[PDB]
Amino acid sequence: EEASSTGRNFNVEKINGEWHTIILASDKREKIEDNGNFRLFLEQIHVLEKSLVLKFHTVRDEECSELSMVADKTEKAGEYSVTYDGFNTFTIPKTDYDNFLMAHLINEKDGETFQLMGLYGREPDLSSDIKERFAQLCEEHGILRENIIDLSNANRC
């Protein structure tokens, strides 16, 4: 079965555990390019009562660096917020819990904004069919495929 974090049947406990960044997308491409602050490689999600603890690593000059973030539930069900290079809010528009998770995030910094979308997998890669479904979700948010970056061949340290 599939669910959205904003949906009535969402079961947040089921997204707990191991995840990997498979594809990142943004309407401001530089944010997810080589030295972008949003080129984050997810490692795990720890589900807590009113928050999610996210563990990631970033890469630079071929060197991995760990970083953790705590995302808090907001007043709208299925939405979380976290401070990181500005103020962010995000939801999970589609996940099947066992294979993939698609997240949509809005960043606000210095009076500006941009959208980020991420495709995460339980394994270090996903099927071409799931990757195509992600491209379609990106299209629905006005993000061109040329702004979608597959990082499956570079998500391990």
Ligand SMILES: CCCCCCCCCCO
């Ligand atoms: C539901 C947990 C998935 C992570 C939320 C998206 C955060 C994007 C990090 C910058 O690429």
